[PDB]
Amino acid sequence: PDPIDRLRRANLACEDDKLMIYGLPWMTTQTSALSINSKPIVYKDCAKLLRSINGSQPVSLNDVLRR
Amino acid sequence: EIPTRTLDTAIFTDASTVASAQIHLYYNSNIGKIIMSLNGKKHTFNLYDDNDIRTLLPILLLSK
């Protein structure tokens, strides 16, 4: 079994300046993305970083793994 | 050796600091961890640890 397979719906979103992760398996609410030093990511320009599948569609982990 | 992936991505090196980086990563299925090489430093992510997952996923999801 691959523990990454239940993460395949994960996608990023910006809630104002907070970078969030949607689509996680066991989670009721979206949770914050963390920096490499384990802090919640807060970024005024959050929306300019988000990647898309050539439409407003957000990139999911499934999309990344199948590239 | 375990095969690697190479990604061009953006990494939040602090809560509000982002930097472009190329990383090499691999998945060790015996221990359930992803190991990442970033500018000569090794980072380990336990895929059973939700805190580690919340750190790994933005790195993968901002990748080209």
Place of tokens 């920096």: A35
- For residue A1, the tally of other CB atoms under 10 A from its CB is 7
Nearest 5°: the CA angle B46, B26, B3 is 150
* Three state DSSP letters for chain B: CCCCEEEEEEEEEECCEEEEEEEEEEEECCCCEEEEEECCEEEEEECCCHHHHHHHHHHHHCCC
> Residue A41 is nearest to which of B12, B51, B64, comparing CB atoms?
B12
Q: How many domains does chain A have?
A: 1
Q: What is the resolution of this structure in A?
A: 1.5
Residue type, A52: S
Closest CA to B60 of A65, A2, A35: A65
Alpha-helical (H) ranges within A1-67 are: 46-49, 61-66
Interface probe for A, chosen from B6, B26, B59, B61 (most Cβ of A below 10 Å), is B61
Domain membership of residue A9 (yes or no) is: yes
Closest B-chain CA to A33: B54
- Give the number of residues written for chain A: 67
| Residue A52, domain member (yes or no) | no
Q: Which two tokens stand for residue A55?
A: 């439409």
